[PDB]
Symmetry: C3
Subunit: 320 residues, 3 copies
């Protein structure tokens, strides 16, 4: 007779735990993101072998781009090349582009570590460096590593504000991330104020256990995930989010693979009645907002189905 | 003996309504958007205490940007600052940057309502207004409210074409939003033609009940939902969408929070061998295409499971 | 007594195949995309009835834009109009814009194939063709078909690298598309190596049976699906992706509809203290990364529910 109560207790435990009498609806969301703060750059680099001091300020129209869906990118490090005009000129001398005669590199080929098509004229580049000229935007941007001190090293002091509006299409529920009547001056913390939406780059990077400098030398991918477990029944009703953060990049730095996150941005202009462009190689962290969750509500068909299943189970148990 | 038929009737009702004999699969969709129409601007603004006239025309290359996934932005209002050179210059005098001596604002402190780093030497700015100069782009963008008449109030007179292509990966089904051989010169209405994809901005703004000449001042977020409910079984086969619109913005107008939807655009150029740039503070309505739906197909395993469940239920009912 | 074993065999088959004893969790993903390769353009065009030669080379900062979520765009063909000043000038003479008197077209009427607002002055434009001038950017970009040979016809030779990081928030599982210690230099193939993420545009276009040149005239929408079927149980544990491709565009080429994928890009500048802009109509294939999948783990409550259901089923079968 002990098993008769045991199966009843187990069914009650299952029903209380998994909420099998609850119909679950998916999430439909919309994310708004605002990045504040300004940065100050002051350092020196070696452009083409010549020392050059780069100093100035960056406001919220420089280190960012208009949001693409639910994500946002932040400038961290950049390599600048200016005064590029289209024409024939020798490339940066590497192992694969070096030559001693026109026989080595032939016209029409396209190496995967070079831009343009070479013509097969192995001429001296600089200080008796024989490379064959390529058709591209002169001067070709010499491939160099990112500076050891991060240019946008103050990016850990920036602030971000995230507004989330989730919907449940099965039911008549749409809710927001910010309840009306709460303070706006705050800083997120796992213990002090979980509900605080304002994050800080230093804090989110420290939570994952990675230092900002190493992750920012070449950039990476970061992810803020928001879990929405909401009970829409009349009793014990709550719809509140939980925030966590994870590194979305493999963090391997393989030579064959492509470490971090980077791209090239080209700005065009016309001067002296000829077109020209400036190229910035950009390494920065891209933050992805991953919002997910479920919404539960009371339904009778699923409850009846589960009741029938557990009735069959306990009847079979009572049979033997 | 009435219950012995009541249970069967309720089981049949549940099977017919909830479609428990139908395996369900989620949605994989794709959105293609094209916005047309032109806008004419003719108004007067007050910049730096001087009255200026802004007149001209914007076409589809102006008031929008290339689509970012399933979303599109429309320019509605802008504040322009032209001719910024980078250096030390006084900022806009607020209630926190004023001074009576250099000691009011320290050197190196980063204020949350100022772009640049003040140096700690506060001098007059205009009409004997003492502020401490910051190292930023000059002249500093004048903090002012958006003009009371919308510079692009004709934005409500626009048309947008949306093509949706959804898939059901579990089954073999990929369908579109528009069928072949139908008219393409129409206007969406809830009763006249639900299948019309061309959405007039005035129509979508009036369906929700919010006047266009109010949210256009600071922008906003709107969500267009294309709900799909397709029965992929051979019998009673139909797969058609239903369009709905909602306001995805809080619309609380909180001073502490950031109402509307605004961002800063920066355009760089070079004049007299000096790198300058132009700022445009942009307010506009960002439209989101929220697409969701579940595809249903007849399956034997779920039918058998539900049959067993109702067998248990009505057997228990017959027992007592 | 044969049915007694038959129902048990059917239940076992259903459990083994449909994996009803397995709890399924949805997918939370992130996509990183890198596009390599360079293009060379050398052709002749007819602008304003005059022959011109377009020659140059485009690198990875020209034929693309920064990634917008899980998608990326590639330039394929462009029509350029340089040096536009904003003022009153005649438009392109078409059927709906031609006139013989000022009364044919009235001021303030916005036709739906036009950029600008006419003032009602039917003046000569070229070869004694009378049209009423509109207020817009001049010269107005003449409407013409794209050149028959694609300008970026070499775009089919480009390579794209895709990195996928999928998550299962229900469980403790976050995995990646590329495993560590695997060769990077490779080309994707269904039989040779289906795990290589490096996709070739020519290869993917040929896989779907559509020639690259034909769809490159007006562009299109491409869809790459990554399907994940991962079993998280300790036994028979495997979680690897499968790659599929299809065309996301209707490919109807209806005159009323809008064939292909295209958009207008405007680049602003200042010359002689006058603001001018350059317009580029762009046709190109937009690639979408549709990633989806499910994660299966071992759970006891679903197993018990299905066990009870089959208990009722075979008990009813044995009853009659
Ligand atoms: C040292 C270094 N190396 C870079 N790339 N190295 C590649 C890239 C591709 C291939 S492969 O032929 O496809 O296998 C092989 C190599 S390898 O030299 O490491 O062997 C880049 C990125 O430059 P790009 O954006 O122009 O690609 C940067 C940027 O800063 C860099 O500092
Ligand atoms: C009146 C007005 N006010 C604005 N912002 N007001 C803020 C912003 C932040 C903070 S806080 O310190 O973070 O708490 C407090 C305030 S408060 O003055 O309302 O108290 C902006 C936006 O300007 P930004 O884009 O530069 O932020 C505009 C734009 O038009 C505006 O017209
Ligand atoms: C031949 C041709 N035709 C184009 N458009 N044709 C339209 C567009 C709209 C309407 S409708 O009034 O809305 O029904 C009717 C027509 S129709 O002439 O085919 O009947 C475009 C695109 O030009 P836009 O981007 O300026 O729209 C291009 C671009 O190359 C083109 O080559
Ligand atoms: C961030 O700001 C605080 C404010 O006092 C300052 O102490 C700290 O040095 C700053 N960190 C960086 C990296 O600039
Ligand atoms: C907000 O913070 C201030 C000081 O930081 C405090 O005085 C106030 O009680 C808080 N709550 C509200 C609702 O203002
Ligand atoms: C929109 O266009 C119609 C077309 O005639 C016109 O009557 C109406 O006044 C316009 N409204 C606005 C706000 O431009
Ligand atoms: C489309 O609309 C036109 C007039 O707007 C009408 O004459 C025609 O019958 C409609 N249907 C088709 C298939 O053209
Ligand atoms: C693609 O590159 C290969 C490399 O040899 C070349 O043979 C082929 O002609 C190229 N195709 C196009 C369309 O440029
Ligand atoms: C990778 O490819 C190279 C040649 O393409 C081959 O020699 C090597 O064995 C492969 N595997 C590894 C792990 O390098």
């Amino acid at each position: 007779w002990i098993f008769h109560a045991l199966v009843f207790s187990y069914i009650s435990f299952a029903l209380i735990s998994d909420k099998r009498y609850q119909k679950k609806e998916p999430l439909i969301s919309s994310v708004h993101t605002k990045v504040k703060g300004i940065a100050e750059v002051k350092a020196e680099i070696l452009e083409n072998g010549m020392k050059k001091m780069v100093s100035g300020v960056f406001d919220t129209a420089d280190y960012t781009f208009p949001l693409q869906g639910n994500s946002f990118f932040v400038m961290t490090n950049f390599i600048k090349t200016e005064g590029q005009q289209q024409g024939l000129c020798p490339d940066f001398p590497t192992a694969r582009t070096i030559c001693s005669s026109d026989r080595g590199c032939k016209k029409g080929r396209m190496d995967p570590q070079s831009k343009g098509i070479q013509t097969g004229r192995c001429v001296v580049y600089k200080e008796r460096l024989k490379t064959c000229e390529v058709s591209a935007w002169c001067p070709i941007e010499e491939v160099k590593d990112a500076p050891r001190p991060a240019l946008l090293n103050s990016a850990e002091n920036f602030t971000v504000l995230i507004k989330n509006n989730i919907d449940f299409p099965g039911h008549n529920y749409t809710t927001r991330n910010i309840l009306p009547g709460v303070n706006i001056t705050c800083t997120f913390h796992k213990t002090q104020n979980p509900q605080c939406p304002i994050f800080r780059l230093g804090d989110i990077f420290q939570e994952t256990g990675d230092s900002f400098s190493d992750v920012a030398i070449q950039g990476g991918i970061m992810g803020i995930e928001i879990y929405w477990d909401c009970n829409l029944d009349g009793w014990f009703h709550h719809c509140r989010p939980k925030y966590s953060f994870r590194r979305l990049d493999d963090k391997t730095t393989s030579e064959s693979l492509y470490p971090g996150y980077n791209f090239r941005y080209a700005k065009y202009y016309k001067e002296n009645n000829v077109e020209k462009r400036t190229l910035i190689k950009v390494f920065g962290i891209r933050f992805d907002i991953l919002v997910f969750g479920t919404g539960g509500k009371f339904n009778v068909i699923q409850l009846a189905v589960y009741i029938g299943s557990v009735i069959s189970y306990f009847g079979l148990a009572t049979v033997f």
